[PDB]
Design a protein around this ligand. Structure first.
Ligand SMILES: Nc1nc2c(ncn2[C@H]2C[C@H](O)[C@@H](COP(=O)(O)NP(=O)(O)OP(=O)(O)O)O2)c(=O)[nH]1
Ligand SMILES: [Mn+2]
Ligand SMILES: [Mn+2]
Length: 430
DNA sequence: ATTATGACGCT
DNA sequence: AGCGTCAT
């Protein structure tokens, strides 16, 4: 009872940009705004592969991983923007720079953890304590939460979406105890006020809209963020977890969408996250290992301890290209030329990183895939990265992979390469 | 012939 | 160190 810690110590937010690459292209080209729009990589094969989709286009069934030609079948007026091509490959620099814009705004409010190109976690615990001090026990007006949903409300005792949103927010605010500066529900609420301000700042200063989740840990904040996209934020309280999880497929929780989640379902004979509560911690550890078992035991009760890492910058800088089917690299000249192309992009990005961020990478990782191997990587080899020079990096990458070529002929490469990947790692302050 | 990235756990 | 998983 009283000693049963409930995982309510922290206020954590997850901010995710809506259809990010599409918004980057819509800002640059106003003709794409408020239209069914998607971003594609390449064009020759089936129109290019879609990697981002505006919400207008999603209404027609357009999705990521779809070929543009098939997307056009579902939505003939779909507009398309293509990723830049440089040195023969897709170049994502425009989106990385737009990402830095958003991350720097978020960092004004709190230290953030960059989780991907378009989303970051925020630990708002201290910021919430400060705003609570300033409030002096003043209640929180619904006017301060103009885009916030309270998951699970309204309940009990109505036709429009905004009306439902405001109804739930009213029930939530009416139930709040604002004289208690340590009430977790109040703390989450103040956290949501701050996230409204953060999202207002992002849209004002970049033009980009985003959604957000506010809860007590990273997994619940991420799940909350997805409940009311786009351009809205969602508060998931500790109390909302039993009902939320009672019908939540296990695969919806981050890290359970793959083989481990399928094994949870198959071994335990369950479907929903809430069903996990009926097992003891030792039972879960016996099936899924000590770490996973402890994590599942806490997480099905809404509890997770993973910290928001103080990290605004990526830990690695990498360059990769697939060479599918008949485009696979089958000569040594080919392999050297593409290693050089990747290495020149890497050099450019690394040099800009050293200038911006006062650090230098010290290890080069070379990954290849060989024809007939279904795995992502057929082989990974590291070597030293001592100079930001593309010719040196590509020569070293060739040296560490050249023993892969089973061809007796010096010129041919067998079996052909269907992927090259260069990744700079192990940064040190410079 | 999804592709181009990341992060992180395991041994 | 090199490999596998998860994401998207
Ligand atoms: N190169 C590449 N980029 C990708 C891929 N998948 C996603 N991206 C890029 C394109 C995406 O714009 C961006 C962010 O990924 P999300 O947050 O998963 N999707 P979004 O922000 O579009 O929509 P939502 O409103 O549902 O959050 O990453 C991929 O497979 N390859
Ligand atoms: Mn997004
Ligand atoms: Mn994202």
């Amino acid at each position: 009872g009283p000693h049963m810690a409930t995982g309510q110590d922290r206020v954590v937010a997850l901010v995710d940009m809506d259809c990010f690459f599409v918004q980057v292209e819509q800002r640059q080209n106003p003709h794409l705004r408020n239209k069914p729009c998607a971003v594609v990589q390449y064009k020759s094969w089936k129109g290019g592969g879609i990697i981002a989709v505006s919400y207008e286009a999603r209404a027609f069934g357009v999705t990521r991983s779809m070929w543009a030609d098939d997307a056009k079948k579902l939505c003939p007026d779909l507009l398309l923007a293509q990723v830049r091509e440089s040195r023969g490959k897709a170049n994502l620099t425009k989106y990385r720079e737009a990402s830095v814009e958003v991350m720097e705004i978020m960092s004004r409010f709190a230290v953030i953890e960059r989780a991907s190109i378009d989303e970051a976690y925020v630990d708002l615990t201290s910021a919430v304590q400060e705003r609570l001090q300033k409030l002096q026990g003043q209640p929180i007006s619904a006017d301060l939460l103009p885009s916030t949903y309270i998951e699970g409300l309204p309940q009990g005792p109505t036709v429009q979406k905004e009306g439902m949103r405001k109804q739930g927010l009213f029930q939530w605010l009416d139930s709040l105890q604002i004289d208690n500066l340590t009430s977790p529900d109040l703390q989450l609420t103040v956290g949501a006020v701050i996230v409204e301000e953060m999202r207002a700042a992002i849209e004002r200063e970049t033009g980009f809209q985003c959604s957000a989740g506010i809860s007590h840990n990273k997994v619940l904040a991420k799940l909350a963020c997805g409940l009311n996209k786009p351009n809205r934020q969602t508060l998931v309280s500790h109390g909302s977890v039993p009902q939320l999880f009672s019908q939540m497929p296990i695969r919806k929780i981050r890290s359970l969408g793959g083989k481990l989640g399928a094994s949870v379902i198959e071994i335990l004979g369950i479907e929903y996250m809430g069903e996990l509560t009926q097992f003891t911690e030792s039972q879960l550890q016996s099936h899924f290992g000590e770490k996973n078992g402890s994590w599942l035991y806490a997480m099905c009760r809404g509890i997770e301890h993973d910290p928001v890492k103080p990290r605004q910058l990526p830990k690695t800088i990498g360059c990769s290209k697939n060479f599918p089917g008949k485009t696979a690299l089958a000569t040594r000249e080919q392999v050297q030329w593409w290693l050089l192309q990747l290495a020149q992009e890497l050099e450019e990005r690394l040099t800009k990183d050293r200038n911006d961020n006062d650090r230098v990478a010290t290890q080069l990782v070379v990954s290849i895939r060989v024809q007939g191997d279904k795995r992502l990587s057929s082989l990974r080899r590291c070597c030293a990265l001592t100079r930001y020079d593309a010719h040196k990096m590509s020569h070293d990458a060739f040296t560490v992979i050249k023993n892969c070529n089973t061809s007796g002929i010096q010129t041919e490469w067998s079996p052909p390469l269907t992927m090259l990947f260069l990744c700079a790692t192990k940064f040190s302050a410079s």
